[PDB]
Amino acid sequence: PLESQYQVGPLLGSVYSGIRVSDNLPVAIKHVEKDRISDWGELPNGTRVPMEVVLLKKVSSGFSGVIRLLDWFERPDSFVLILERPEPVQDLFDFITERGALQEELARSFFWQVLEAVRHCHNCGVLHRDIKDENILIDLNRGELKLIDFGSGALLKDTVYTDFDGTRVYSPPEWIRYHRYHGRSAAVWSLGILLYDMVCGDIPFEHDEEIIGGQVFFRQRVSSECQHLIRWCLALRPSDRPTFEEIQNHPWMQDVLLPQETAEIHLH
Amino acid sequence: KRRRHPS
Ligand SMILES: Nc1ncnc2c1ncn2[C@@H]1O[C@H](COP(=O)(O)OP(=O)(O)NP(=O)(O)O)[C@@H](O)[C@H]1O
């Protein structure tokens, strides 16, 4: 089965809206050209798929803040991934573009949920490597965030990474200057970028020189507690960055809204 | 000007 187990619809951005005809579940149908893949892995059963598939299988167990792979298919020249599609949905990059700099209460709820999702990944041995507002979807009714696009991801390891294919402006200074990083510490850097994006309405750094200068100028009013968390995540030295635990125990991170509260207060 | 950033 393939083309008629899913009624397929319009382009989203090569990703199509689909409905699984066996039960009308909304889905997203992602096509990936074999030529444009550089990383491959093997599933539990041995067979050789794109890394993206391997990583999504590993995290698609149970419920979480990550968009789940429901199925996939090989074609002669492509793979096709069937993903959860929540509805109504908007990605965080568009949400921030329209709303501007988010209120701290809202930024705290989003950022916490992204931290839970990234922790979930790491627990499954998966490093995303492209955390950013464009790779985050907001389910507007439930107030739940979901991570997408594992296409630059890797298996989590504790040794150094010398390859990177994510977004440069969310990449850390050790990558810019030395083409090396460690997973968690890089992930925390990009989480600092993302947090600034939320409270200020745009990312802090556009150019390599700004990234390695680590001078964080705040363009909107932001509380001292939040500025501190952000500066901590954006420490130049990787070992000076906070662990995931220290981020979630930070004073600015306390008394988070539940997802449904977040929807009711800020999204409905 | 706020913009998206490709991989
Ligand atoms: N459930 C969903 N899963 C994935 N993408 C979605 C979903 N719903 C909407 N989209 C849109 O599809 C866009 C592209 O998906 P993404 O997973 O980022 O692919 P990409 O890496 O940019 N390109 P490619 O993987 O080469 O097709 C997103 O930015 C979303 O706005």
Distance CA A165, CA A37 (A): 12
Q: Which residues pair with A90 in a beta bridge?
A: A138
Residue A15 alpha carbon to ligand 1 centre in Å: 6
A39 neighbourhood in chain B, CB within 8 Å = none
E-state strands within chain A: 6-11, 15-20, 25-33, 40-42, 48-50, 69-74, 78-84, 89-91, 126-127, 136-139, 144-147, 154-155
Residue A91 alpha carbon to ligand 1 centre in Å: 10
Looking at residue A6, its amino acid is Y
Distance CA A66, CA A192 (A): 20
- Residue A152 contacts B where some CB pair is shorter than 8 Å: yes
Pairing of strands A6-11, A15-20: antiparallel
Q: Do B2 and A97 touch (CB under 8 A)?
A: yes
Closest CA to ligand 1's atom 13: A13
**Resolution of the PDB structure in angstroms:** 2.5
Structural determination approach: X-ray
- In this structure, are residues A149 and A13 in contact, taking their beta carbons and an 8 Å threshold? no
Give the residue from A180, A206, A182 showing the smallest Cα distance to A193. Answer: A206
Count how many residues are written for chain B: 7
- Tokens representing A191? 């989480």
Distance CA A79, CA A61 (A): 21
Dihedrals φ, ψ of A183, to 5°?
-65, -55
Positions of A annotated as catalytic residues are 130
Distance CA A28, CA A17 (A): 5
Break chain A into its structural domains and give their ranges: 1-87, 88-268
Sign of the torsion angle spanned by Cα atoms A95, A263, A135, A178: positive
Task: Assign a CATH topology to domain A88-268.
Answer: Transferase(Phosphotransferase); domain 1 (1.10.510)
Give the residue from A81, A78, A107, A86 showing the smallest Cα distance to A197. Answer: A107
Closest ligand 1 atom number to CA of residue A52 = 25
Residue bearing tokens 């985050």: A136
Distance CA A208, CA A175 (A): 10
- Residue B1 contacts A where some CB pair is shorter than 8 Å: no
- Tokens representing A183? 């997973």
Is A147 close to ligand 1, i.e. is its CB under 6 Å away?
no
Neighbour tally for A263: CB within 10 Å? 19
**Looking at the domain covering A1-87, what would its CATH class be?**
alpha beta
Looking at residue A223, its amino acid is S
Helix intervals (H) in chain A = 51-59, 92-99, 104-123, 173-178, 183-200, 208-213, 224-233, 244-248, 259-262
- Residue A168 contacts B where some CB pair is shorter than 8 Å: yes
